[model samples]
Target: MKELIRKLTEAFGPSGREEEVRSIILEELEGHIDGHRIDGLGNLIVWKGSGEKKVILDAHIDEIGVVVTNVDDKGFLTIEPVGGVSPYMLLGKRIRFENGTIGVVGMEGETTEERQENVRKLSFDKLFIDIGANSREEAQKMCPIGSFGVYDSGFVEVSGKYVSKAMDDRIGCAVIVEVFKRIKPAVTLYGVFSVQEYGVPADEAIAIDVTDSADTPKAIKRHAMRLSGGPALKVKDRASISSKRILENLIEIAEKFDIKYQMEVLTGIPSATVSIPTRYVHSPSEMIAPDDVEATVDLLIRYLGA
Candidate 1:
């Protein structure tokens, strides 16, 4: 599991540009799974066993990334998000391009207003990546339009919970990979690692949202996936509601295994797992308990009987 988490986080694929990530997944899954392939939109789907039951545990393959929208006169590059990137998460952050140029994203807007104002409303249009370029020509020489970027982020175990960027769906992706490696399911397991699930209609189904827990003191209702519990048994979230019948069978599995599970009915994308036309999500430093990830793996293995 440690190797599993480390490898996925290290892969460099974000949103539409998931080739590197997919390659890593394939490498990890080579000779260890039933079958795998790339979909039209670049979804990596891996399947195991030959059962009538088809279970698709989906985790988005794409991370929150940036596109080189424009090269500034001074060689700095302007970018917009490939997915939901809160202003709170973008300013003064590390970024990497497809060509492997290292850079930092800094806001050009007024520092005073940006500090005192609501950062969530701000966009990367007011932000730029400083790659040590001196002129527009040099920057253009380094990057081209349509090249994608990601936060180039990873996770850390601190205060018992894992603080990390891209945990939203990457964690789910990690779960899928681990399950594939650890089990041989009786039913056909389709581990769908998809792209473009952050906003708008994701091009596919079989989404297993690795999400944050809704355990809170002021919690009006369940709104998060607890970190220590076994795979976050998602009933209904802001991204897409789980099929009711499917969810019932899932509940049965949870009870059968006694996995430490919780429920979250999201009011706002269910915690940065995915975005919608309306609602704000947790930015970088999105909070989730680490133990929950372990529990999720346990449940998946128990179900698959490997």
Candidate 2:
């Protein structure tokens, strides 16, 4: 599970450019799935078994990234956020473009206080990515305007917890993959490794993704979610409310199967969600518990197979 999660998270798939991520998933699903197709909008939809009830399990394959907007004469590239990238997270980080060109993020400021204040009031305009190119022509040749790139951070295990970039939904994607490998489904299951999650029609759909945790020191006491707490059954979030009937059914299954579970009332599309508690979401290094991921995989397999 950790190995699969690492591969998916490290791949460069920013919003509109999800081909690389999709390809990796397809390779992983190679002989494990029954049938698959790429939708018009680049969603990778796969299925196993057939039954009266059609179930959709979705996880967004796209991660937040940056796009090159301008190439300066000194080979510095001006960039803008492709998704919810914070300026504070941009400085001193490495970004890898689709072509494997690595660029280091730097800010414009003369002194320590100026640099600190610049980041405090940071915006995309204050940042530039240096690809070690000495001229605009060389830099442009490498990463032309509109080139997309993602955080170049790799996966690392921290005291049984996994930390890496793009865990927001990649870990969820890993869950779906594991479920496909293990499930003996009673219902027709469509494992949608979707791009930009950020859909499908079925009798029931569960958006398996990450949710914010309030467990960190000085963290906002908005909710009770914490790392390693187990999969969160969504009650409500900013975008959508989960179906009461489905939510109740999920809880019943968890209790019946002795699977540890939690509740999510903080924050999507799929009517219901089974979330992995994630800390430092949208940053370069998001964190999750392997136990929570395993629990989610177990819960889903049991839910579908039952």
Candidate 3:
């Protein structure tokens, strides 16, 4: 389980260009599951058992990355944010690209901290990435229209807490993977992962992945999922509401298996996902309680009767 957490946390694929990460997941699942396939948006769908019921468990393989929208005469790359990122955490962090080139995220001016704290939007006009390039031609090979960048963070266990970038859904991804390694359920598990949830879930899709709620003290708005309490069995977040049956089924499993779980109701209108980067992504760090992750993985495994 610990190794699974490390792999998922370290896999280097962000939305739209998740090939690298997908390969990592596939490698991990090799010889463990019967078979698997990759879907349109690069989500890996794996089948575990020949069950009458299809149980889908999905986690987005994507993370927040950037696009090179503008290049300056001095060869500095000014890019737009491809996903929701806290403009606050952007500066002074290390970013690695798919091309194996590295860069430092820098925005001019003296108000680094102040500008970040009060940032309202990810304006492409002001943000630039410096890769030690003196001309556009040299850097394009290093960065292009659609490349990936991460907060260059790691999974650190501090006082029993696991911290990293992109845990919002990646941790959920880890839960599903850990469960698949041990659980054999009556229902078919489809771990559906898709793109752009960092801003909003791709509503165009036929199905979706949902979490209960994630926010600071309160959810974005009214009818929000409670911030903290019991271990839960949750459905919807921002928009995806847990079906009563699904909710109850989880509850039943929790009771019979003596698992730790909780329930939550979400209320989010405009931005359904965690609305990540409201000061969150692309930094080398994001916060997560290891206890929550452990409890979540254990509950999912127990439900599978593992």
Q: Decide which is better by lDDT, 1 or 3.
A: 1
TM-score of 3: 0.77
Better of 1 and 2 by lDDT: 2
The global Cα lDDT (0 to 1) of model 2 is: 0.88
Cα lDDT tens digits, model 3, 92-130, are 777778767788888665677856643555455656889
Model 1, which residues run further than 4 Å from truth? Answer: 109-121, 197-206, 214-225, 236-242, 266-282
TM-scores of all models? 0.80, 0.93, 0.77
What local lDDT score does residue 187 receive in model 2, on the 0 to 100 scale?
Answer: 92
Q: How high is the lDDT of residue 40 in model 1?
A: 76
Q: What C-alpha lDDT values do all the predictions have?
A: 0.65, 0.88, 0.59
Per-residue accuracy of model 1 over 1-306 as CA lDDT, tens digit each: 666666676578776677888888888888778787786777777778776655666677777778888887888888888777765577788888888887888876567776455455675567888889999888887887677877766666666655556666666777778778778677777777878552222222345565545454564654444445455444454333435545555567678888766654535111112211100133555555556666767766776553
Per-residue lDDT of model 2, residues 2-58, tens digit only: 789989888888888888888888888888789999988889999987878889998
Ranking by TM-score: 2, 1, 3
